[PDB]
Amino acid sequence: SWGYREHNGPIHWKEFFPIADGDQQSPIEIKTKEVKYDSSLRPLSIKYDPSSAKIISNSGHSFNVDFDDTENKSVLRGGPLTGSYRLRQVHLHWGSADDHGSEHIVDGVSYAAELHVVHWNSDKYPSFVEAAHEPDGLAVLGVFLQIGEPNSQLQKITDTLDSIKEKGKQTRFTNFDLLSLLPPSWDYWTYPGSLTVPPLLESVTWIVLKQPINISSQQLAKFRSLLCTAEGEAAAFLVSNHRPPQPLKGRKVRASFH
Ligand SMILES: NS(=O)(=O)c1ccc(C(=O)CSc2ncccn2)cc1Cl
Ligand SMILES: [Zn+2]
């Protein structure tokens, strides 16, 4: 199955999910001179309940913090969105070097990593799985990480990693104040796109914050010590898990600010 190693990595995904070569694929290059300021975009309306976080797991592809998405305690509204998008899960993408780890790239700057906050449209769809197949179904908030001072909220995640080193492992994780993890400015870019992992469905309204948050180099390096292999299989490390930028194909990237 798919991964980020030589034989199964991004350049091969098109062979086994042809929508990899679709018209609305993510991530992208964000060219700030090409983006259009749009006065109809709204500020983000963000409500994240720290008690919504329940479990952290290693998928083999990243870690995932799963939130209880039974009801509307944690939702994203506003921004480019119509209606209410329910928080489902948080995960991270990084590279082998601090030099180049994010998925979206801004005027050629990669960041050290990129956090994705995944939400689904419960005002139109009954479940995440249904929403994931529709153009208006999902909203992802992307937040860049740059190397700087250690991040006390991220230290809570890094403290769990030894317990989920193998693919498939999980452990309880709650009291996670996602709202306080976001940067001071919520100015953003937005465009229509896709999941950045198989199945690569073109169901995502991307919301990428301009301002990065900081992480230390030692905290970021802990993520690379997760395995992409399960207990009992020959070990291989998830040292890098970001997809390259994909063609814009005529989409409009809009800015909430100017
Ligand atoms: N890179 S990305 O585009 O932000 C992205 C990555 C993975 C997934 C999922 O596979 C589903 S959210 C979920 N995943 C596993 C279990 C329960 N919910 C969805 C998205 Cl939008
Ligand atoms: Zn992601």
Side-chain angles (χ1 to χ4, degrees), residues 48-252:
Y48 298 146
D49 183 331
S51 78
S52 280
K54 298 301 182 185
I55 290 167
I56 185 168
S57 60
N58 178 355
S59 65
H61 316 298
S62 188
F63 69 89
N64 289 103
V65 175
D66 296 332
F67 298 76
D68 179 1
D69 72 346
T70 307
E71 62 175 8
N72 270 338
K73 296 171 183 250
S74 290
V75 298
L76 178 59
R77 288 170 292 183
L81 305 170
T82 290
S84 185
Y85 286 71
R86 195 180 294 177
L87 179 62
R88 173 109 165 161
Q89 56 103 332
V90 165
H91 66 273
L92 187 72
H93 298 272
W94 55 82
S96 79
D98 296 346
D99 324 7
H100 196 261
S102 63
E103 296 216 303
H104 292 88
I105 311 297
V106 181
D107 287 313
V109 172
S110 283
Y111 294 90
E114 184 173 325
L115 192 80
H116 288 161
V117 188
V118 177
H119 311 75
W120 59 274
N121 184 346
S122 63
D123 283 348
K124 284 191 61 185
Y125 306 104
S127 65
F128 173 73
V129 169
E130 293 292 351
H133 291 270
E134 284 318 319
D136 61 348
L138 301 185
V140 182
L141 184 67
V143 185
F144 296 123
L145 283 69
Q146 65 180 9
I147 299 303
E149 146 167 302
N151 191 299
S152 60
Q153 279 313 104
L154 300 176
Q155 183 93 350
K156 308 183 158 59
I157 295 176
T158 61
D159 280 350
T160 73
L161 301 175
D162 286 343
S163 73
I164 60 164
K165 165 198 207 263
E166 295 85 11
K167 179 184 177 159
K169 289 263 256 278
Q170 76 176 232
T171 198
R172 71 171 65 199
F173 186 78
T174 192
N175 206 19
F176 174 65
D177 189 350
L178 181 57
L179 190 66
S180 77
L181 182 69
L182 305 181
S185 176
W186 297 345
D187 292 346
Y188 65 88
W189 303 285
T190 180
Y191 73 98
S194 67
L195 272 59
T196 70
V197 296
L200 296 164
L201 300 172
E202 294 181 337
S203 53
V204 180
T205 300
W206 274 97
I207 298 168
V208 175
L209 302 187
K210 171 179 176 177
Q211 183 174 13
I213 66 171
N214 301 98
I215 188 172
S216 64
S217 178
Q218 297 86 0
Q219 287 178 318
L220 180 61
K222 203 157 198 183
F223 292 102
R224 301 185 181 101
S225 77
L226 291 173
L227 302 175
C228 59
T229 58
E231 256 151 318
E233 178 189 0
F237 295 93
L238 186 69
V239 295
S240 186
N241 64 342
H242 61 276
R243 184 185 193 202
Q246 301 301 311
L248 194 59
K249 289 181 172 178
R251 289 178 287 176
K252 186 191 297 187

